[PDB]
Design a protein around this ligand. Structure first.
Ligand SMILES: Cc1[nH]c(-c2ccccc2Oc2ccc(Cl)cc2)cc1C(N)=O
Length: 109
């Protein structure tokens, strides 16, 4: 059931926002501030920005037809990070730790 699936997606996102993962999830909580120093080229490289607060808003406004569409936005958020940053960047390591949480929960739902 798509409705039951989306309740599980809300549960996965709630865990990603939890204190347990806060040490590595915090760069992903809100949209990237493209006006901050070092991010002048962010909009040139990243055509579709995505963050956990936008995904939470999209869940609340019923913008995902199913778990697949929610999953696509969570993976878009990680892919933006892997695309934009150097592979040795600390933020890329954080994205990987959060993606481990997401992929495990998303697979077992
Ligand atoms: C997804 C993302 N969030 C941020 C970000 C968000 C809020 C406050 C600061 C931020 O800057 C940081 C830079 C280096 C580290 Cl280690 C962590 C975060 C940057 C990026 C990215 N460069 O991709």
């Amino acid at each position: 059931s798509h409705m039951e699936q989306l309740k599980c997606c809300s549960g996965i996102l709630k865990e990603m926002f939890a204190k347990k993962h806060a040490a590595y999830a915090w760069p992903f909580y809100k949209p990237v501030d493209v006006e901050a120093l070092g991010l002048h080229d962010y909009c040139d490289i990243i055509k579709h920005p995505m963050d956990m607060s936008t995904i939470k808003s999209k869940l609340e406004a019923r913008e995902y037809r199913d778990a697949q569409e929610f999953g696509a936005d969570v993976r878009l958020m990680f892919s933006n990070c892997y695309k934009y940053n150097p592979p040795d960047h600390e933020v890329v390591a954080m994205a990987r730790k959060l993606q481990d949480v997401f992929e495990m929960r998303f697979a077992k739902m």
